[PDB]
Structure formats: C-alpha cells, structure tokens
Design a protein around this ligand. Structure first.
Ligand SMILES: CCc1c(-c2csc(N=C(N)N)n2)[nH]c(C)c1C(C)=O
Ligand SMILES: [Mg+2]
Length: 104
C-alpha cells in the first residue's frame, strides 16, 4: 500500500529524530563492541531500514515492523536493561509500539 508505507516513513523519521535514538542511528561496530558479532546474528539499525525503505525494499508494513522490532530485540539481547543503550532502547521500543498501534 501507498498508505501502509507512507506511514512507515512518518514513524521512521520520528524514530530517526527522537532524543533516545542515538544508539540506533548507525550499525553497531563489531570491531568496537566485544562479543557483538558472536551474540547478535541479525543486526539492524535505523539507517539500514532507511536505506531499505527508500530503495522500496519493503513490500508490506509488516516487514518494516519486523525490522523495527529486531532493533529492540537485539538491544535487550545484548545490553542490560539498566545500561545506557538499554535504557534508551526501552524508550525507543515503547515509542515504536505505541505509535504503531495508534495507526493499526
Ligand atoms: C553499546 C554500543 C551500542 C550502541 C552505540 C551507539 S553509539 C555508542 N557509544 C557511545 N555513545 N559512547 N554506542 N548502539 C547499540 C545498539 C549498541 C549495542 C552493543 O547494543
Ligand atoms: Mg517481540
């Protein structure tokens, strides 16, 4: 749908610009994060969804939502809930779930 994916733009822009978005704008650099490659099989981040979305690489809004949920799953997999990335991921995750349900 044009509408299904016109909305994925709105929310991704809103995540891209959220105060808590800083852990997720770029891919995690495994050279700098010991253990990340080993633990996180499928990395995901906002710039990667942005690339895929501009490219037309999403066919349904469900695919987009899967990529968003994967950012936060990988976050909670790797970081303790009281870590700084962890605290930021809970804010970004709660923002995403609520903004996504407000539409669907
Ligand atoms: C802790 C590193 C990390 C960042 C990140 C972005 S920027 C930065 N470093 C400073 N602000 N010093 N860390 N993002 C995610 C999703 C991470 C992990 C391992 O899950
Ligand atoms: Mg889940």
């Amino acid at each position: 749908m044009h509408s299904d994916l016109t909305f994925c733009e709105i929310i991704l822009m809103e995540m891209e610009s959220h105060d808590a978005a800083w852990p997720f704008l770029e891919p995690v650099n495994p050279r700098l994060v010991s253990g990340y490659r080993r633990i996180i099989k499928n990395p995901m981040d906002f710039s990667t969804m942005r690339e895929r979305l501009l490219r037309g690489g999403y066919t349904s809004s469900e695919e987009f939502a899967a990529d968003a949920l994967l950012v936060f799953d990988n976050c909670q997999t790797f970081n303790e809930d009281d870590s700084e990335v962890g605290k930021a991921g809970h804010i970004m995750r709660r923002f995403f779930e609520s903004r996504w349900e407000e539409f669907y």
